[PDB]
């Protein structure tokens, strides 16, 4: 139910003049209150307003705050860093090098409501103008098992900051106002207590499935849920669809049983996803398993016999930190019919990347992908062999399911190409996600197809811009063949037509 934003993993990388960087940060984290990836506050210059940061309450990955000459950063209601991915493989939060030429950088970081970081540590360094950050006691927030990798360059050369209000215990505050007092909920509980209490009162002690704390003892009163949430409650595991009966020694259906999707327990899995028999929504079935459709449900089933190659996507498994398909990994897709993930075709493959020790890619090897008919995630094509006129290698591709989408939105992207036509003759369904066709200076026939009949969800949009103008293509005769103009065409030839 909570508003949702993806996040950024650009790390210390900048996008454009610092203006454009700020615009991208605002655009992404505007009205966002749960960050599904990483929160990255970088290159934020002074005289720029970071008001929208107030909405953020939860971050799954790491939070980086670096290179900011802006004075205040209002992450006031952020309550949890789940540390599902680290910065430098060790830090769940890192506020680094937020300083200026005249030592006039970051000054205020009123994170009054942060109480827990499940996994990871934090690191502070080169914080010359940051005030009152020294006072913070991080033994409360961070789990004990990480206190070792915990780095701490708490030193202030300026030393011109208002101290902590008497309402702040142990003189620990994130700022000035007594509202910035560091509320503590970890060790100051009781011996019997294990959950993060409200206070040293053993009565005011919280559930284990509580994360930051609680407003009441029961699990519905948890501030943040530790693992899963079911509607308004928090659970270690989502309620099973069927429970064991100790008396009858048999299985019996659970009424409160719901399916497992992400960190949520939902009564129905999303349509493009797969349902496992255990009762959870999965993005891909493991090896020796395949996807079928049975009685309205796409389900994983164990296979003995034909099956197929695993055919993991780019960014997954073998291709862990692979930017594009190329000679080092092109052989693994020999007879792949379904792609368990994403495909990225980038110019670096054809040029070659010495830094990743990648040799150039022969264009002719792309034909290996002719056998692919299904892609479970998204297909991004930013480079293509100049000599070819269409996306010939995907002539037999039939469906893209959009389980994983580029930037959380796009399942098909074809950009920056010299192709005259698309040639996706066998394409029939884009289950979810938007389709961008842009920057293709010689492309013409893309505007004839009614993409809405290839879409499986109301709301999927198509953005077709910055290609060869339709009037110019009509003038040059680059239009669909006349024997086949009911629905459109992927190119000039009758075969490239669709309805025919």
């Amino acid at each position: 139910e909570k508003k949702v934003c993806q996040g950024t993993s650009n790390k210390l990388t900048q996008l454009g003049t610092f203006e454009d960087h700020f615009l991208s940060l605002q655009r992404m984290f505007n009205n966002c209150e749960v960050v599904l990836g990483n929160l990255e506050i970088t290159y934020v210059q002074r005289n720029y307003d970071l008001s929208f940061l107030k909405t953020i309450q939860e971050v799954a990955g790491y939070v980086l705050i670096a290179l900011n000459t802006v004075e205040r950063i209002p992450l006031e209601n952020l309550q949890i860093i789940k540390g599902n991915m680290y910065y430098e493989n060790s830090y769940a939060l890192a506020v680094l090098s937020n300083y200026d030429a005249n030592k006039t950088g970051l000054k205020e970081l009123p994170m009054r409501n942060l109480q827990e970081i499940l996994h990871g540590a934090v690191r502070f360094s080169n914080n010359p103008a940051l005030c009152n950050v020294e006072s913070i006691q991080w033994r409360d927030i961070v789990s004990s098992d990480f206190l070792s990798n915990m780095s701490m360059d708490f030193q202030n050369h300026l030393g011109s900051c208002q101290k902590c209000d008497p309402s702040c215990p142990n003189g620990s505050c994130w700022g000035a106002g007594e509202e910035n007092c560091q509320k503590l909920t970890k060790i100051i509980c009781a011996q019997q207590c294990s959950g993060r209490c409200r206070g040293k009162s053993p009565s005011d002690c919280c559930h284990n499935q509580c994360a930051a704390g609680c407003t009441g003892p029961r699990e519905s009163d948890c501030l943040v849920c530790r693992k899963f949430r079911d509607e308004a409650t928090c659970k270690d595991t989502c309620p099973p669809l069927m429970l064991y009966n100790p008396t009858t020694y048999q299985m019996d259906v659970n009424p409160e049983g719901k399916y497992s999707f992400g960190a949520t327990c939902v009564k129905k899995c999303p349509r493009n996803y797969v349902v496992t028999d255990h009762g959870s929504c999965v993005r891909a079935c493991g090896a020796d398993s395949y996807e079928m459709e049975e009685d309205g449900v796409r389900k994983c089933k164990k296979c003995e016999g034909p099956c197929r190659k695993v055919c993991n996507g780019i960014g997954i498994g073998e291709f862990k930190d692979s930017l594009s398909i190329n000679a080092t990994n092109i052989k693994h897709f020999k007879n792949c019919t379904s792609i368990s993930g994403d495909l990225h075709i980038l110019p670096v493959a054809f040029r070659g990347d010495s830094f990743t020790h990648t040799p150039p890619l022969d264009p002719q090897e792309l034909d290996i992908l002719k056998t692919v008919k299904e892609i479970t995630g998204f297909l991004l094509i930013q480079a293509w062999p100049e000599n070819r006129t269409d996306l010939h290698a995907f002539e037999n591709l039939e469906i893209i399911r959009g389980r994983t989408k580029q930037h959380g939105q796009f399942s098909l992207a074809v950009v920056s190409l010299n192709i005259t036509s698309l040639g996706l003759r066998s394409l029939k369904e884009i289950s979810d996600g938007d389709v961008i066709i842009s920057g293709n200076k010689n492309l013409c026939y893309a505007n004839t197809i009614n993409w809405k009949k290839l879409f499986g969800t109301s709301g999927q949009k198509t953005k077709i811009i910055s290609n060869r103008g339709e009037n110019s293509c009509k003038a040059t005769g680059q239009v669909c063949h006349a024997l086949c103009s009911p629905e459109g065409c992927w190119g000039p030839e009758p075969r490239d037509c669709v309805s025919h």
């Binding site: 996008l15 454009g16 961008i436």
Partner: protein, 47 residues
């Protein structure tokens, strides 16, 4: 004082951008052109 510029060997680190050196981390990163995101100016971004 807070950034410098990268060596000649790091010509192709930024696919769509210019290389930066960050002095406090002693690390190297990218300044991407408008409309390109990622640590190495990898993918094109919506607008």
């Amino acid at each position: 004082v807070s950034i410098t510029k990268c060596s000649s060997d790091m010509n192709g680190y930024c696919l769509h951008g210019q290389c930066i050196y960050l002095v406090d981390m002693s690390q190297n990163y990218c300044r991407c052109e408008v409309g390109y995101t990622g640590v190495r100016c990898e993918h094109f971004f919506l607008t």
